[PDB]
Ligand binder design. Structure first.
Ligand SMILES: Nc1ncnc2c1ncn2[C@@H]1O[C@H](COP(=O)(O)OP(=O)(O)OP(=O)(O)O)[C@@H](O)[C@H]1O
Ligand SMILES: [Mg+2]
Ligand SMILES: [Mg+2]
Length: 265
């Protein structure tokens, strides 16, 4: 299914703040009824991929919450129908095997192995005696951050949905693996799934069908990657002018995005 937002604005509501902390003063923003997002416009066709990026605390996660219906659109129109699958920035793990963590209600062999392979989990499970039957405890505390993220991504991807919301799965040190995952999973396996990827990597904007850049709760840019280069030349030149920007830490990339966005308001 597609997704459309026409001139959407959303305000800080009581309880959204405490909800926000878990997926990653409040009551003051709530009292003055400040916008967390203002005049958001996007039109994503079925099967397209939208890359969302922006400065830190620009309202990327909230945009996702708006789609989940955890945050209401006081103004504007949000159109989309169907199941949503959400992969939060916080990578969670329930007691049980790796396999059991990925599988939802129904187990289906071809689907499962396809998701495991595309999420690059084969490289992981081959290091364990019991492979994907290996038992994990709550939080999967001895895995790497990348391993928890790939498992949690595979769980969300395995889910049969019409729209996938992937909040920042590509933010860890094992960047070459992340490059493979992005290619195999987001670009190939999910090529025909409508998907929104929150990201701080330029390769992802370059490969996206549509791009939304957020800053201070507003749309700094929305369009194609071609359009970004010609319409936001200052931003583009600074960001593409890097050698291997995508291999900086998540923190440095976000820091650069923020500084650049602040600069070119
Ligand atoms: N854990 C938190 N504690 C306090 N305030 C928060 C927290 N998370 C978000 N906010 C506030 O809510 C607003 C929207 O934040 P949101 O998480 O949607 O932005 P984001 O771009 O997803 O953040 P990040 O850069 O961390 O991914 C921001 O203005 C921020 O000030
Ligand atoms: Mg497509
Ligand atoms: Mg976030």
């Amino acid at each position: 299914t597609g997704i459309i937002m026409e001139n959407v604005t959303a305000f800080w509501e009581e309880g959204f703040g405490e909800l926000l902390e878990k997926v990653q003063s409040f009551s003051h923003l709530c009292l003055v009824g400040n916008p967390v997002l203002k005049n958001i416009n996007l039109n994503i066709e079925k099967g397209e991929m939208l890359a969302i990026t922006g400065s830190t605390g620009s309202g990327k996660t909230s945009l996702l919450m708006l789609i989940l219906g955890e945050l209401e659109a006081s103004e504007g129109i949000i159109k989309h129908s169907g199941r949503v699958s959400f992969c939060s920035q916080f990578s969670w793990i329930m007691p049980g095997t790796i396999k059991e963590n990925i599988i939802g209600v129904s187990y289906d062999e071809y689907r499962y192995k396809s998701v495991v392979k595309a999420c690059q989990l084969q490289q992981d499970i081959t290091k364990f005696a019991e492979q994907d039957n290996t038992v994990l405890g709550e939080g999967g505390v001895t895995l790497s951050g990348g391993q928890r993220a790939r498992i949690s991504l595979a769980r969300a991807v395995y889910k049969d949905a019409d729209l996938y919301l992937l909040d920042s799965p590509f933010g860890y040190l094992d960047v070459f693996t992340e490059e493979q995952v992005f290619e195999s999973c987001v670009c190939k396996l999910m090529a025909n799934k409508t998907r929104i990827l929150v990201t701080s990597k330029m390769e992802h904007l370059r490969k996206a069908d549509k791009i939304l850049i957020l800053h201070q709760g507003s749309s700094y840019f929305y369009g194609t990657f071609s359009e970004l280069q010609s319409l936001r030349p200052d931003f583009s030149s600074k960001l593409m002018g890097y050698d291997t920007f995508d291999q900086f830490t998540e923190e440095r990339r976000s820091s650069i995005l923020t500084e650049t966005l602040r600069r070119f308001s």
